[PDB]
Assembly symmetry: D5
């Protein structure tokens, strides 16, 4: 059959510089995600002296923070952490839609991959069930995408 | 285990200049938000003469006002206040979605943080229960993101 | 304590452009009638108003773009009505027409009053037509003066 | 008030019209084009001034319409096609994205783009609207093309 | 009645195609890739002119596709993957955003991007569409690559 | 063509005895409905000495009241008035569904027509727009259905 | 593999049919009645054996149909009418309750009741279904009357 | 214009005997309702020894308990208390719909009014804001419908 | 704990089974019955102990099933058919009512009634489930019939 | 001040019947295991428990009806799980199974614990299975003693 050139994913974090932005709304979720995220990054070989962590009040403030960090081009990839948890109103949909749209835009316009670790759930229990796993996944996504972006960069 | 560099959030509002745009639809809600917002800003050290306040008819008119103020680059951070309360038709979704989108886009394209304090609720009672708290929250958001923006500049 | 810019409703000397979508034409006509009446109440000269019409709400965006780009108008107004039928097209037209109106205002600096109703029944549109038209005139006059206020 | 009113202009003589037809649910798009071409000729659009291109589906409309609008050889463009709901959320995705691309093209290039993409739940709904919609898009293109020149 | 009709061109000879496969629900993306590659070869695309990349999830498709489109080494791109509803609103977010990014890349770079990301409620739905959607994307990338060349 | 026997509607209220049950939740709506209902009944010829009016707190209490009145068989028809107005919760659907189901059941099981004048709306404005018209319609429905039930009774 | 199969019987000779027509959105119920009566006659139902009653709305169908079923003068009943969505949740209430009453009467009296009450969002939908549903109800009442007799 | 006979509602609770069934799911809510309900009943003249109170695990178990009490015909009226708070799944609709339906059917088939004081809300905060008020409302409903039932008997 | 466990019994020997097939979307109901009869014979149900009746639509199921259950000639009944969503709310009405009638019959007569009425959005969904569902209803009827006797 | 009947959890001497639906069998088995374990903790003798199984949630109603009608049980328990798939059948089975359980309890006076999960994902069912089974045992024991308390 057809056999094209397949770029193999690269999960080696050695030498990578990673920036993390953590929303503090429903802060216990952000904390659990960050803990699991750092643990995984170190497991992938990311030096702890090469990781910066910043926090913002809520998920709507992620975009402006991530935008500045990507503009500096000091980071091979960024990570957004936080949790939008549904309350009583339509504001759940507004914050979920807008935070994701900002994250997606930053990666597209600056070339810096941004892992989206922002949960958008109905209950505190759903956020707790996903916090630790989501943090670790974001660490793997940031390492893999930093390396893929480098591979596609001349 | 791992221990990276942590930027501790800074809420010192001394010397900041803040701009506020308040939509007047369901005016009582925006008024309660604005009173709480100014009261909180003073609590964080923002000078009275360091704050400008503007008002627009509705939430859809916010975007153009916030844009003009941010482009001047006279403000470290901005705040949008107001309330969209559902009526009988899909217009509630239209105004809620568009107002929020304009706020987010302004902060992204100018680098000036914009706290989104526009409620999007089904009933007047829900808006009442959230007005004062949200206005205070936006003051803390603008001061903190203003400091964070400069640190990253 | 702080600086407060007071709303300015003096429409004297303002140049206002209005774009009316003709779908469900009865609604747009009632809005335009109430809108022109209101503008004159604010002091807008009849000679300072240009009115154009387009087939539907999706055609509003391209029309308002050209008019705002000329910068011959201090503010614009969009009139019309999307009324739900049998299919999802209602959401599409409501979402997109609003997004275009919002985008033009942000990108050109010229305020655009959104007078496009997004309703389920003819009756809902009829109940809101005359009001919304007058509201748009007040929004355009206030936001037009407002825009000049923040400029040099 | 008798403000300056730009009367809509439906004279198609001398206009260059481009058409992009999505072929998913092909019967619908073909009925739309058959009615569209009939109407354009009725309004005076020369057969030699119309080009017709086709694409597999509604999501491919944006790239094709963008290239033709960028050539600035066309006074206005027309998008034909039909999204018909199936079993999954992809119906909302294709409906939203195709309309957003059409709108964005018209705002950014100044070339009006008639939106003749139906977004329906059933084959029957698409069949009821196809021929009427195609004719409607022809009238939207001629009117908006003449309108764009007036403001240019 | 008798205008210029551009005929679709499905000849894949000489074309260079880039493919990005989201690995979430990996079996689906892999089945799509098999049918896509087999169909590209059926259409005459040389295996030496196809590059394949993979990413963790559909939200990472944008940054990968954007980089490939920027290089301008490819006549068309293909996005493969599957969003499958779980328990939360994250399904809508990933469906909406991935589609919006794919659409945006094609419009702003001129490189057609076939959108083969499924957005379904069940695993069974994704499986039923996997192979058919992969081959459809092969035909879409070839046809639109040839169409883009025609309007250049 | 086919020409069957068509029973002509009869709107003569003379000699009819009508019972009304008014829910007081969002009381201004019930009041407007009752006023318009009485006016219309008198216009149809219903003697005011032949009409009884009772009220209950809310629409969920309509069923038990209407059930007793229908059981006495002192009434040729009954009328339910009131308004369920949506608030913040699913209780709007529960009260709307259940009040209508009770009204419908009473008519089916006792043979006494029950006009359903209970509005189920999203806003106070929608209830106000419909109060007076709905009250009058219920008066016409009770008169017509009392007469139709008599016609079908041997 | 080879069981007892009861064949449907559409012979309307000798049958007595009762019809209740809700008059809300009256044009719809009247169009249903015309097609229903014409189809009953086509099926052999004698006009002298059909009684027609009308009621204000679909919620009054239950009490009228219940009285007719109690008399046991009819081999089958037919309910005609149309619920058309307005602005509020009352559309669901009347759709649900009228259908539930019709269904309940047939189960507890043994008299089949054809349910020809439409529950639609637009006037156009009701019009498109009116005549077809009326005749369908004629065939349903005749066939089920004959089936009910078979199992007695 | 027209002037028919008007039965003025009567809220005299003297001599009434009331039965209450309280579901314990989200127990704090039912407790606040029950405290308000008993307090209101005394305000309307119901004797302490004239009230029986029973509790069941959840709202679905109400129906069987309310039925047994109503069939005894020892009570002039009954009250159902509790709260269904939405979680992650469709079970919220199932319990809300079925619990309410059982309450309505009991009042219809026995002639004993049953006040429905079972909240059906999305959040714990909504249940909290409504507990005390609803419990008081149910006391007034049971007393008034109890008097109305006897007047029509 | 080893409580008394009644083992499900699937021996169809000696059972009398009644079947009612709605004919709306007839291809579906016929595929359901073809699989159903195959399975019943597999479990040992004699061909001479099965009667098959048909009705126009799912709303007519309740009256027919009620009469057959009331005869007490059948150990269990089977309802076949398919409601396929169209353009309006009538899909929810027919789905809800048909299922409620089937359930009510089984509770009130003690005759188990297998519910093999599909409630789907598309023709394709009905075709995917028809044959499997028909076989499933055969096994439900035999097991529940034997189960009813054990508790009788 | 008033009379308060205290909940009684002493299960000694109670006779409990359990009906387990086998659809998504893993869930029902985990519920039954946790339920039997809990019942013994309350003092229910193993010899006083009968357990029966049915194919699906819709078959629960007829089974519980026969068991409650014998009055050999102080309370019953229904176990099982409805898990959403691709179609509306999820709502139908969830609504009807609950309605039957509620109706049996009201009409026979015997409490019935509703242990039927109505969830969207397998994971939601797995997270709730063991819990709900134990909860049902406490509900049946408490409500069984409760039912005797209100009787002579
Ligand atoms: C209801 C709400 N929920 C969340 C949430 O779940 N997660 C989150 O990060 N932020 C939430 N917010 C606040 C907005 O994200 C934002 O910080 C404010 O509107 C201030 O601009 C709000 C208002
Ligand atoms: C119906 C409506 N509702 C609100 C609302 O709830 N909150 C708000 O801030 N503004 C509302 N508006 C006004 C629109 O945002 C806008 O001002 C007009 O559509 C055009 O000026 C309108 C028109
Ligand atoms: C169905 C429809 N409805 C409306 C409406 O309710 N309000 C409105 O202003 N326009 C409507 N249109 C027309 C579209 O806006 C547009 O003109 C067509 O899609 C053709 O480009 C259409 C096609
Ligand atoms: C399922 C589907 N449905 C439609 C439709 O109803 N209308 C339409 O115009 N196109 C449809 N498509 C095709 C997509 O727009 C597109 O071609 C694919 O996602 C591949 O890029 C698809 C794939
Ligand atoms: C919940 C989820 N579901 C899917 C899915 O169904 N299909 C898919 O392709 N990707 C999914 N993702 C992953 C996001 O696209 C993304 O990788 C994460 O948010 C990490 O950035 C997530 C997070
Ligand atoms: C929210 C609510 N709304 C209404 C309403 O709009 N109309 C009405 O008549 N009653 C309402 N209720 C109360 C219930 O109908 C009922 O009276 C209580 O639950 C007491 O049993 C409630 C709880
Ligand atoms: C709003 C409404 N809509 C309809 C409809 O669309 N079709 C119909 O047949 N009946 C409707 N009704 C009337 C109710 O069935 C009923 O007559 C009133 O509630 C008076 O009892 C009402 C009230
Ligand atoms: C999830 C759940 N939620 C509630 C609730 O919000 N309110 C309530 O009163 N009961 C709840 N229940 C319990 C059920 O009503 C019932 O007790 C079980 O399904 C069977 O005993 C359950 C199981
Ligand atoms: C539109 C429609 N759809 C279906 C369907 O999808 N499945 C089905 O079994 N029956 C359908 N019916 C027929 C109705 O059940 C019924 O026969 C009519 O309302 C006339 O009584 C109708 C009328
Ligand atoms: C699709 C389906 N899903 C479930 C489910 O999730 N849980 C359950 O208990 N039963 C299910 N069933 C089976 C029905 O309850 C029933 O057995 C069939 O409709 C055959 O009568 C069916 C058919
Ligand atoms: Cl984007
Ligand atoms: Cl999980
Ligand atoms: Cl944005
Ligand atoms: Cl800007
Ligand atoms: Cl940017
Ligand atoms: Cl509301
Ligand atoms: Cl709150
Ligand atoms: Cl915008
Ligand atoms: Cl209004
Ligand atoms: Cl622009
Ligand atoms: Cl049409
Ligand atoms: Cl290559
Ligand atoms: Cl785009
Ligand atoms: Cl780009
Ligand atoms: Cl462009
Ligand atoms: Cl398929
Ligand atoms: Cl009923
Ligand atoms: Cl009205
Ligand atoms: Cl006769
Ligand atoms: Cl029924
Ligand atoms: Cl009856
Ligand atoms: Cl029966
Ligand atoms: Cl049709
Ligand atoms: Cl009831
Ligand atoms: Cl009872
Ligand atoms: Cl009764
Ligand atoms: Cl919630
Ligand atoms: Cl409240
Ligand atoms: Cl029973
Ligand atoms: Cl399947
Ligand atoms: Cl019940
Ligand atoms: Cl849980």
């Amino acid at each position: 059959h057809m056999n094209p050139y397949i770029l193999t994913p690269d999960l080696n974090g050695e030498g990578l510089h990673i920036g993390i932005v953590r929303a503090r709304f429903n802060e216990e979720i952000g904390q659990a995600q960050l803990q699991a995220c750092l643990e995984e990054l170190g497991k992938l070989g990311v030096d702890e002296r090469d990781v910066m962590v910043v926090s913002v009040p809520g998920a709507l403030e992620l975009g402006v923070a991530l935008a500045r960090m990507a503009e500096s081009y000091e980071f091979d990839a960024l990570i957004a952490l936080g949790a939008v948890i549904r309350g009583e109103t339509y504001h759940f949909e507004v914050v979920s839609n807008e935070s994701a749209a900002a994250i997606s835009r930053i990666a597209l316009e600056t070339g810096i991959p941004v892992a989206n670790g922002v949960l958008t759930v109905d209950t505190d229990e759903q956020a707790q069930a996903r916090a630790a796993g989501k943090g670790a996944d974001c660490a793997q996504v940031a390492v893999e995408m930093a390396n893929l972006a480098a591979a596609l960069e001349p």
